[PDB]
């Protein structure tokens, strides 16, 4: 039994029918009181009497919100390990199978990581840098918020949470030596799990859609766009590439233009432009479509 918080404890169980649950005693947080009673949030009546209550934790029923009687509270969380591997049941993976999808709109240090939950009840999330080694990049993240936009995958829709993170600004470097190592703690009711990821900003760069898309009739039209305002500056150093199509990184029937403009031929068609880092084969922007006269 290890201490996650002051009155919230996590116990790791072998989750094998023959394995004996770990025996650990929990006492009421009031030192001098005697003749107390005990309950659990999954039990109706009293289940303990002494100032300290031993407990054997093999199943989920043996865990919950143990409340003195209301002198104090204690919470038990289970982290299953089955055949030596820990459970990954709270979160739902993407088609990639990554449990955490991080992406950055620029090279500033800001980035957002998002994840899908199988089942959205009594969920508490905490994300932080996973390495305390001195040679480690420091990242501080805010709190996780649920997204009104659900996500569909394998003929099923899932709810999505996300968090904004920011690398503690040091002096700039042209490349990234060590990866950013993050870890997420997920807490379904009476279940604890943790997920980790390692990434470089250069690989999570997803440029924002192009802005100010205009077109001028030519002999044949000149389609002109502009770099996203969220993109890093100087744009000369942080060059972008643009794929154009008429009607991520699908580029089906699409051509490349490394400038802010090109000349396409369309009638009654809609022209679309996406962006990407000119040099690193990173993620491509969402399409910024516009009709063509």
């Amino acid at each position: 039994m290890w201490e996650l918080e002051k009155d919230v404890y996590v116990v790791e169980v072998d989750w094998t029918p023959d394995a004996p649950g770990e025996t650990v005693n929990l006492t009421c947080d009031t030192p001098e009181e005697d003749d107390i009673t005990w309950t659990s949030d999954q039990r109706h009546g009293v289940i303990g009497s002494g100032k300290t209550l031993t407990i054997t934790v093999k199943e989920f029923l043996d865990a919950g919100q143990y409340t003195c009687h209301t002198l104090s509270h204690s919470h038990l969380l289970l982290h299953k390990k089955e055949n030596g591997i820990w459970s990954t049941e709270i979160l739902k993976n993407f088609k990639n199978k990554t449990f955490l999808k991080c992406e950055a709109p620029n090279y500033s240090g800001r980035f957002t990581c998002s994840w899908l939950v199988q089942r959205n009840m009594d969920l508490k999330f905490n994300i932080k840098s996973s390495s305390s080694s001195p040679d480690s990049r420091a990242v501080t993240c805010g709190m996780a918020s649920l997204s009104a936009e659900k996500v569909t995958l394998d003929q099923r829709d899932y709810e999505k949470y996300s968090v904004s993170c920011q690398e503690d600004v040091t002096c700039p470097t042209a490349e990234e030596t060590l990866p950013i190592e993050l870890a997420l703690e997920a807490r379904q009711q009476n279940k604890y799990e943790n997920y980790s990821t390692s990434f470089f900003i250069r690989d999570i760069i997803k440029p924002d859609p192009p802005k100010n898309l205009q077109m001028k009739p030519l002999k044949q039209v000149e389609v002109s766009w502009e770099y996203p305002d969220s993109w890093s500056t100087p744009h000369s150093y942080f060059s972008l590439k643009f794929f154009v199509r008429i009607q991520g990184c699908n580029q089906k029937g699409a051509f490349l233009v490394e400038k802010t403009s090109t000349e396409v031929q369309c009638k009654g068609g809609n022209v679309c432009v996406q962006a990407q880092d000119r040099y690193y084969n990173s993620s491509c922007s969402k399409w910024a479509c516009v009709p063509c006269r």
Partner: protein
């Protein structure tokens, strides 16, 4: 100027070379990207500290015929000089790996990339480890992934020197 075309060609010859790598060296963790990013110039390079635009240097606490004659900077001079040493280091490693690979089929280093690092080295200028057959293949992939990220940094610098 005009060193931009050599950095672009180096980017092209490197990208289609790593494509040749993660295709022929399948199931070598090459395409899996699980291989750790290993910089071979880490000990003697000033590329990461210097090869940055002057606009990003906002705090005080932080030859070759490629630098623009209009704007000359000591930091940019150090950047171009460090890039030269990086390419030479990768040249010696690649030439040694190519010797072992040419004897043993699956992979061969692109002559275009090897002449691209040299032509860019000359514009900037105005003994190798031991490995077995399986290990020399892995080493090439780890080098190619790090070399791709370094050429990307070079191309950003050259693009910044031009048009500015």
């Amino acid at each position: 100027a005009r060193c931009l075309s050599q950095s672009r060609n180096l980017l092209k010859t490197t990208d289609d070379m790593v494509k040749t790598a993660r295709e022929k060296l399948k199931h070598y963790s090459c395409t899996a990207e699980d291989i750790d990013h290993e910089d071979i110039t880490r000990d003697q390079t000033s590329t990461l500290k210097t090869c940055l635009p002057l606009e990003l240097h906002k705090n005080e606490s932080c030859r070759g015929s490629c630098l623009p004659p209009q704007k000359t900077s000591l930091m940019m001079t150090l950047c171009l000089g460090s890039i030269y040493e990086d390419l030479k280091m990768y040249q010696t490693e690649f030439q040694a790996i190519n010797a072992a690979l040419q004897n043993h089929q699956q992979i061969i280093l692109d002559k275009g990339m090897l002449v691209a690092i040299d032509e860019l080295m000359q514009s900037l200028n105005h003994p190798v480890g031991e490995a077995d057959p399986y290990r020399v293949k892995m080493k090439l992939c780890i080098l190619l992934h790090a070399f791709s990220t370094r050429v990307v940094t070079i191309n950003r610098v050259m693009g910044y020197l031009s048009s500015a």
